[PDB]
A paper describes a structure:
To investigate the assembly of the major capsid component, we determined the structures of the major capsid protein both within the assembled head by cryo-EM and in its soluble form by X-ray crystallography of the recombinant protein (resolution: 2.6 Å). Comparison of the two structures revealed major rearrangements correlating with the transition from a soluble, monomeric form to an assembled capsid. These rearrangements are unlikely to be caused by crystal packing since the same compact conformations are seen for both of the independent molecules in the asymmetric unit of the crystal despite completely different environments. Taking the compact crystal structure as a reference, these rearrangements can be described as the stretch of the N-terminal arm and E-loop in opposite directions with regard to the central P-domain. In these conformations, the two structural elements form an inter-molecular beta-sheet with their counterparts of the neigboring subunits within a capsomer, which results in a circular strand exchange. In addition to interlocking the capsomer, these interactions allow for quasi-equivalent interactions modulated by varying bending angles of the N-terminal arm and E-loop. These quasi-equivalent interactions observed in the asymmetric unit of the capsid ultimately allow the formation of pentamers and hexamers with different curvatures, which are required to assemble the large T7 icosahedral shell.
Numbering used by the authors: 4 to 93, 109 to 233, 240 to 260, 264 to 278, 282 to 357
């Protein structure tokens, strides 16, 4: 058998393709107990108590909800049988090879969970997660309601100057409503919003005198399917244009709202928060993922399990906006 330390050496050694939305969640807190403290994350002294309510059949049950300074994150726990005879696309040598593939698959399950939690927190200001007594609960971080907009880019006589002004309103509202007052320079478009912005913008956007300047965070996405850096939109305020068409799997959905545009700043200063994983003898383990191997009977197999308890909390919930453009 291998110790957690030995399994972490393997699990952590390789490089994994960059996460798009988490680039705005650079900070990290590995909490010492089972609870996450928002007072140690959220900047706004009025917004340090997010509203947590059960999400039952899509509907948020606000009645049985409360404001809380502290949260108990549910464990993300992939568990797989270690079969040395397992089919891997590329005796003890093969056993180790199986463990490493499984550890990589587990690390991916945790990493993608962080990314989708980042996507939801940044886009909506709230994240739907697994609860303690309910299968799903909503953690509302209280982003200003003016930062969730609606417009119709499919209406008659809409121009590129009108579309940029919708985007600019959003960044000016962020400047007004955010702690820092940061000027947004990044605009993540969903695929339908982008196609819409290009349907209307055409000649004025990509032509001989286009606004798009198509010419090192912008080049790390070349080999990433779903992410496309389009260039800076030159304005007499040079906007960075991102298009996100990434999909993930639910027990397959789009990471970014396809018919919307999200504006975001580095001032969101999102924090990857992690609860400590309780271990019988070793006590609490403050880790992002925690691999454990063991032999058992009933069934007579060897198991590998990577446990983690995450939440992606924004420091400044008001440092981003979402603008829906179609229906």
């Amino acid at each position: 058998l291998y110790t957690t330390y030995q399994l972490l050496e393997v699990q952590r050694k390789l490089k994994t393709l960059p996460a798009f939305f988490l680039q705005w969640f650079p900070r990290q807190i590995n909490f010492q107990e089972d609870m996450i403290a928002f007072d140690k994350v959220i900047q706004d002294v009025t917004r340090v108590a997010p509203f947590v309510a059960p999400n039952v059949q899509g509907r948020v049950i606000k009645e049985s909800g409360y404001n809380t300074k502290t949260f108990k994150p549910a464990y993300v726990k992939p568990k797989h049988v270690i079969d040395p005879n397992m089919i891997i696309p590329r005796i003890a040598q093969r056993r180790d090879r199986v463990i490493a593939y499984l550890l990589m698959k587990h690390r991916a399950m945790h990493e993608n969970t962080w990314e989708w939690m980042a996507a939801q927190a940044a886009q909506y200001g709230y994240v739907d997660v697994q609860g303690q007594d309910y299968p799903l609960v909503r953690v509302d971080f209280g982003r200003d309601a003016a930062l969730t907009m609606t417009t119709d880019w499919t209406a008659a006589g809409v121009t590129l100057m009108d579309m940029i002004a919708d985007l600019r309103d959003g960044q000016r509202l962020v400047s007004d409503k955010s702690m820092s007052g940061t000027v947004i320079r990044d605009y993540v478009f969903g695929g339908d919003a982008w196609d819409q912005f290009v349907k209307v913008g055409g000649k004025e956007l990509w032509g001989k005198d286009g606004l798009m300047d198509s010419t090192n965070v912008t080049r790390l996405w070349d080999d990433v399917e779903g992410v496309q850096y389009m260039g800076e939109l030159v304005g007499a305020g040079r906007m960075r244009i991102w298009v996100n068409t990434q999909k993930y799997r639910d027990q397959e959905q789009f990471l970014m709202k396809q018919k919307a545009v999200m504006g975001i700043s580095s001032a969101i200063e999102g924090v990857r928060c992690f609860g400590a994983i309780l271990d019988k003898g070793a006590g609490y383990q403050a880790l992002d993922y925690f691999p454990k191997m063991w032999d058992q009977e009933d069934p007579s197999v060897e198991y590998l399990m990577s446990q983690g308890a995450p939440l992606m909390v924004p420091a400044d919930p008001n440092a981003s906006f979402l603008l829906t453009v179609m229906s």
